[PDB]
Write a protein that binds this ligand. Structure first.
Ligand code: GTP
Ligand code: MG
Ligand code: MG
Lengths: 107, 68, 48, 83, 136, 49, 48, 337
RNA sequence: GGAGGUCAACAUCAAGAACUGUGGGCCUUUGCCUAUAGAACUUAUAACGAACAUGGUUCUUGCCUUUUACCAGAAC
C-alpha cells in the first residue's frame, strides 16, 4: 500500500503542500472524531521537510516497466517476421561408368 | 410522399407502455458469462494488383467463363 | 460428359421453376423432349 | 537413366572397397533430410570405418550426405570423402 | 510497390493462416485434466489409506530376503486383473473409485486397468502392478 | 458406423457427418505397384478395428 | 458491393442450391450489364 | 484579453517525434470502417469492413489469421473486451452481435434498435454494453441477459460515437445535432451538455490517463475535461474537414484522420499541430477514395493503425531518429482566433 | 416415542477421478507442505432417467416460386 493509497489521496509537493495535505486529511479523517493516521504521521514527517519528501518520492514507474517489456516483445516479434544439382549429377555419371564398366578414373 | 427525410426517434418508443409478449429469441440461453484471467522448323511462327472491381484479373476470368 | 449431364438436370429444373401452373400435359412434353434428346444423341453412353 | 540397371549405393560400395573402409547399415537411427524442396526426407544411415573411426552416411537420390559438426547433413562429392 | 518502394511492406492477404477452428483466445485451464488419456489420482490427500500402515512396509525393503516379486499371467479373461482387484480392495480401506455399484459389485471393479483405451476396449493392455504387504 | 459412413447389414443408415470425401492426394505411397491385393478388406472389418 | 453480390449469387447457382425464382432473372441481368461493360472497355482500350 | 495571448507565448510545448509509414495491408474487398485491438496481448486486430466481414489480422507480421462473417450488411463498429473473452460487433443491420473469442461463433444477439447501430462501447467495470445509432438513443444492454436495461433519451439526431467511463459521466455521446452529452445513467438523464461544436460531432476519444475526452467536428477539434465538464483546450486546425476519427496515444499524442486524406497529428497538452501527412491513394484508386475511416493505437502506443477508404489498412510507425536535429514541426505560432 | 404420507420448505447432485472439517510448519488471509477425523446420493461399454421429447442461433444439405410448416447431419 502506498502512502498515497493509505491516505486515499492522489499522487512535487512543497513542504507547505505537505503540511496542507495533513491538515486536509485531519479535517476529513480526524481520529478523535472517527491506525491509518500512523502512516500519515510518518509520511508527513518526511514530507513536512521538503528534502525528505523529495528524496522519499525519488526512491506507476513499474507499470512503465511493463510498457518497456511490451515494447521489447513487439521489437522481437516484428523484425523476426520480416551445388546440390552438381553433386547428384556427378554421382549419376559415376554410376554410368560402373554400368558401362569403363574403368573409373582416380575420381 | 417518398423517401426518409428523417428517422424515427427511439425516444417515442421509450414512453409507451410495455405489452409483455414473450419472444422465442429472448428465451434464456448462454446464461453464464466467461471471465478472462526438322518437323519443328517448317511452321510459320515461334522459332500486378489494380484496385477496382471491373478491371481486376479475377473479374475478366469470371465473365470470360460464365458468359461462354 | 459431365457438362451435358448438368445441362439435362438444369433443364428439368427449368420445367420445374417455370411450370408453376402450366398444367400437367405441357410439362410432360417438355420432360420427354429433353429425355429423348439426351438419350438419342448419346443413346449408347447413358447406360454407364 | 531409368534404363541403367546399376544402382548408386553400388557405386559407393565400390568406392569404399578401394579405400578399404567398411560400410554398415545401422538399423534404427535415421536423419531428417533437406533436399531442394521445402521439405525434409527421412533416410536410414550407415557408418564407415577405416580402422576404428565411425562416420555416418545417408544417400538419397544420387548423393552422399555427411553431417556437419554442429549437426544436420550436408551433401558432399564422392571424391570429397576421406574420413 | 513504387508508391512506397523502400521501407514499406506491401502485403496482399487472401486465404488464411490459422485454420478457423483455433481458439483465437486460448482457454485458460488452471488444473491439468488427465481424465482423457488415463484415469489416475493426482494429490497426496486422495491416495487411499492402506490399513497396514505403508511406513511399516517401507521398512521391509531393507531386508532383501523378505520382499518378493510375483507376476500374474494367463490367457484372455482368466481373471488376472480382477484377482489383483481382490488383493487391493482387501488391503486399502477406502477407495474413491468404488461406486456403490461395484462395492457390492455386479460390475467388476477393475483397478489395475487404469487406461481409457483399456476401459473402453474391455481388455488389459499395458502391464500395471502394485506393491503391498500382506500377512501369510 | 455413422462417423465412418458405413452400414452394418441390418443397421441404420445416416448422413455422412463428413460430407467431403472428394479431396484426393496423390503420392507414391499407396501406389498400385507397391501393393499386394490379398483379401478384399470388406466393410465389416472397418467397424471392428 | 453490387458486383460482388453478382459473383456470389452466380457461383451459388452453378452449384444449384435453393436459388429463388427471381434471383436467377436478376442475377442474369447483373451479369449482362457487367459483360457489356467488359466489352466496351476492351474496345476503348483498343482505340487508345 | 491580450494577457491570454502573452500567456500563450510562455509555454513552448511538448516536443514529440514525427510518424511515418511502416506497412500496407490490402485484403478487404470493401472499405474498412472500424478497427479495434486486442486489449491484452497486442497480438492482433479486428477490422470491420464494408463487405460485412471482419478479418483478424496479426499485428506483428500483418498476416491474416481468420475471418468472421455473420453480418448481412456493413459493420460500422467493433469492440473487444478486457475482462471477457468477448468481441461485440455491430452493424447497419440493426443488430449487436456478441462473439465468443474461444470458439469463434456468435453467442448472443441483442435486439431492439429501430435502425442501424453505429457505435459500441464496453463499460469497463459493469458488464454492460452501450450501443447507439440512428435511433437517436443510447441503449445500455445487460451483457448477460440481453435486456436493454436503460435507454438514454437526449440527442435530437443520430448518435455517432459513444464512450464509457468508470466514474461519473459513465457515458459520453456525440451526435449530429452538434452536441456532446455527458450522461448520468442511474438517474438516466443528462448530467452536462457541451454545445460548443458548430456541426456534427463525428468522432471522440478518451485520453487513457488524464480523464478527459477529445471531440471533433468539421474544422475544429476541441478537448473536454470530464468531471466538471469544462472545456480544457482547443486544437489549432485550419480547414482539415472532415475529421473522421481521433485516437490518443499514451504519450499524449492526438491523431486526427481526415477525409481529405491528411493525417493531422497533435500534441494533446498544447493544441499544437506538429505534423501533417498525406497518404498515397493506391495503384488504381480514385483521388476521392483517399481518406481515413478509422484508427487506433496499440496498447503501447508506438504504432498506429488506420483503415482507409481505399480498401487498405495502413500501419504508421514513429521515427526513432528524430530528436532536435530535425524534428521540428510547424513550431507554435498562435494565430489570432 | 415407533410406523408411515402420490405432504411441504430449504440444502445438494458432472468434477485435478474430482468432498469436507480439524491439528501443526513456511510465506504473508490467500497459498504450499505435513498430521488427523468423517465421507449420504450419482458415475467406467461412464451417470441423476436401465427412459427420451421440443425449441433457439450458426453452419452444411434436401424439398424447390416466396414465408410459416419442413428434409437430415454437425457445433454451441
Ligand atoms: N464367472 C466368472 N466370471 C469372471 C470371473 N472373474 C472374471 N470374470 C469375467 O471374465 C472377464 C475377465 O475378467 P478380468 O479379470 O477383468 O479380465 P482379465 O483377467 O484382465 O483378462 P485380461 O484383460 O486379458 O488380463 C470379466 O469380464 C469378468 O466379468 C469369475 O471369477 N467368474
Ligand atoms: Mg487384465
Ligand atoms: Mg412478398
Amino acid at each position: 500500500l502506498n502512502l498515497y493509497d493509505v491516505l486515499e489521496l492522489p499522487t512535487y509537493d512543497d513542504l507547505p503542500q505537505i503540511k496542507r495535505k495533513y491538515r486536509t486529511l485531519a479535517l476529513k479523517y480526524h481520529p478523535d472524531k472517527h491506525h491509518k493516521f500512523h502512516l500519515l504521521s510518518t509520511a508527513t514527517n518526511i514530507l513536512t521537510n521538503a528534502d525528505v519528501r523529495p528524496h522519499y518520492d525519488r526512491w506507476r514507474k513499474t507499470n512503465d516497466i511493463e510498457r518497456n517489456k511490451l515494447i521489447q516483445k513487439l521489437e522481437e516479434s516484428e523484425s523476426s517476421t520480416i551445388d546440390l544439382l552438381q553433386i547428384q549429377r556427378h554421382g549419376e555419371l559415376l554410376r554410368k561408368l560402373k554400368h558401362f564398366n569403363l574403368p573409373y578414373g582416380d575420381w | 410522399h417518398r423517401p426518409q427525410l428523417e428517422a424515427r426517434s427511439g425516444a417515442k418508443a421509450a414512453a409507451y407502455t410495455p405489452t409483455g409478449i414473450e419472444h422465442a429469441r429472448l428465451l434464456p440461453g448462454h446464461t453464464t458469462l466467461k471471465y478472462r484471467k526438322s518437323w519443328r522448323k517448317g511452321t510459320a511462327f515461334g522459332r500486378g494488383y489494380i484496385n477496382d472491381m471491373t478491371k481486376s484479373e479475377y473479374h475478366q476470368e469470371f465473365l470470360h467463363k460464365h458468359v461462354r | 460428359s459431365e457438362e451435358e449431364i448438368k445441362k439435362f438436370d438444369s433443364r428439368i429444373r427449368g420445367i420445374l421453376m417455370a411450370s408453376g401452373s402450366t398444367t400437367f400435359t405441357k410439362v410432360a412434353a417438355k420432360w420427354n423432349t429433353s429425355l429423348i434428346s439426351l438419350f438419342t444423341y448419346f443413346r449408347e453412353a447413358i447406360v454407364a | 537413366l531409368g534404363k541403367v540397371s546399376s544402382s548408386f549405393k553400388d557405386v559407393v560400395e565400390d568406392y569404399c572397397l578401394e579405400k578399404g573402409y567398411l560400410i554398415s547399415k545401422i538399423p534404427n537411427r535415421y536423419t531428417q533430410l533437406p533436399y531442394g524442396r521445402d521439405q525434409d526426407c527421412i533416410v536410414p544411415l550407415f557408418e564407415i570405418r577405416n580402422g576404428k573411426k565411425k562416420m555416418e552416411v545417408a544417400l538419397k537420390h544420387d548423393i552422399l550426405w555427411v553431417e556437419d559438426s554442429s549437426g544436420t547433413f550436408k551433401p558432399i562429392y564422392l571424391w570429397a570423402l576421406d574420413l | 510497390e513504387h508508391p512506397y518502394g523502400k521501407e514499406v511492406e506491401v502485403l496482399m492477404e487472401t486465404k488464411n493462416t490459422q485454420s478457423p477452428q483455433t481458439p483465437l483466445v486460448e482457454p485458460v485451464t488452471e488444473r491439468t485434466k488427465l481424465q482423457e488419456h488415463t484415469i489416475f489420482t493426482q494429490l497426496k490427500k486422495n491416495i487411499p489409506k492402506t490399513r497396514y500402515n505403508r511406513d511399516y512396509m517401507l521398512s521391509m525393503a531393507n531386508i532383501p530376503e523378505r520382499i518378493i516379486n510375483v507376476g500374474v499371467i494367463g490367457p484372455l479373461h482368466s481373471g488376472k486383473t480382477s484377482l489383483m482387484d481382490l488383493l487391493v480392495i482387501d488391503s486399502h480401506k477406502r477407495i474413491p473409485d468404488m461406486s456403490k455399484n461395484v462395492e457390492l459389485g455386479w460390475k467388476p471393479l477393475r483397478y489395475l486397468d487404469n487406461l481409457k483405451q483399456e476401459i473402453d476396449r474391455g481388455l488389459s493392455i499395458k502391464l500395471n502392478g502394485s506393491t503391498l504387504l500382506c500377512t501369510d | 458406423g455413422k462417423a465412418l459412413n458405413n452400414a452394418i447389414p441390418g443397421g441404420p443408415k445416416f448422413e455422412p457427418l463428413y460430407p467431403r470425401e472428394e479431396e484426393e492426394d496423390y503420392n507414391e505411397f499407396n501406389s498400385i505397384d507397391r501393393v499386394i491385393f490379398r483379401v478384399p478388406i470388406r466393410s465389416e472389418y472397418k467397424v471392428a478395428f | 458491393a453490387w458486383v460482388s453480390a453478382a459473383h456470389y449469387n452466380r457461383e451459388r447457382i452453378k452449384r444449384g442450391a435453393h436459388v429463388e425464382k427471381t434471383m436467377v432473372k436478376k442475377n442474369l441481368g447483373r451479369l449482362t450489364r457487367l459483360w457489356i461493360k467488359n466489352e466496351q472497355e476492351r474496345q476503348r482500350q483498343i482505340q487508345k | 484579453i491580450v494577457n491570454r495571448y502573452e500567456k500563450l507565448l510562455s509555454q513552448r510545448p511538448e516536443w514529440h517525434a514525427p510518424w511515418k509509414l511502416s506497412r500496407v495491408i490490402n485484403g478487404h474487398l470493401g472499405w474498412v470502417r472500424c478497427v479495434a485491438i486486442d486489449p491484452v496481448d497486442n497480438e492482433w486486430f479486428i477490422t470491420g469492413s464494408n463487405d460485412t466481414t471482419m478479418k483478424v489480422w496479426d499485428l506483428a507480421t500483418g498476416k491474416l489469421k481468420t475471418t468472421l462473417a455473420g453480418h448481412v450488411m456493413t459493420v460500422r463498429d467493433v469492440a473487444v473486451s478486457d475482462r471477457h473473452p468477448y468481441l461485440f460487433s455491430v452493424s447497419e443491420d440493426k443488430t449487436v452481435k456478441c462473439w465468443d473469442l474461444e470458439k469463434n461463433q456468435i453467442i448472443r444477439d441483442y435486439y431492439g434498435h429501430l435502425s442501424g447501430v453505429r457505435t459500441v462501447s464496453i463499460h469497463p467495470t459493469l458488464d454492460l454494453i452501450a450501443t447507439a445509432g440512428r435511433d437517436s438513443v443510447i441503449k445500455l444492454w445487460d451483457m448477460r441477459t440481453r435486456i436493454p436495461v436503460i435507454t438514454l433519451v437526449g440527442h435530437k439526431g443520430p448518435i455517432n460515437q459513444v464512450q464509457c467511463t468508470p466514474v461519473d459521466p459513465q457515458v459520453v455521446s456525440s451526435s449530429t445535432d452538434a452536441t456532446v452529452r455527458l450522461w448520468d445513467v442511474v438517474a438516466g438523464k443528462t448530467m452536462k451538455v457541451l454545445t460548443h461544436h458548430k456541426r456534427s460531432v463525428r468522432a471522440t476519444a478518451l485520453h487513457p490517463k488524464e480523464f478527459s475526452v477529445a471531440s471533433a467536428c468539421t474544422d475544429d477539434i476541441r478537448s473536454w475535461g470530464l468531471a466538471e465538464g469544462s472545456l480544457l483546450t482547443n486544437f489549432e486546425s485550419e480547414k482539415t474537414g472532415i475529421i473522421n476519427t481521433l485516437s490518443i496515444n499514451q504519450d499524449d499524442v492526438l491523431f486526427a484522420g481526415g477525409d481529405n486524406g491528411v493525417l493531422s497529428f497533435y500534441d494533446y497538452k498544447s493544441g499544437h499541430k506538429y505534423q501533417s501527412l498525406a497518404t498515397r491513394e493506391m495503384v488504381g484508386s480514385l483521388e476521392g477514395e483517399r481518406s481515413v475511416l478509422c484508427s487506433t493505437f496499440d496498447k503501447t502506443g508506438l504504432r498506429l493503425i488506420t483503415g482507409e477508404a481505399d480498401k487498405s489498412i495502413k500501419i504508421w510507425k514513429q521515427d526513432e531518429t528524430a530528436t532536435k536535429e530535425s524534428e521540428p514541426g510547424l513550431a507554435w505560432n498562435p494565430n489570432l482566433s
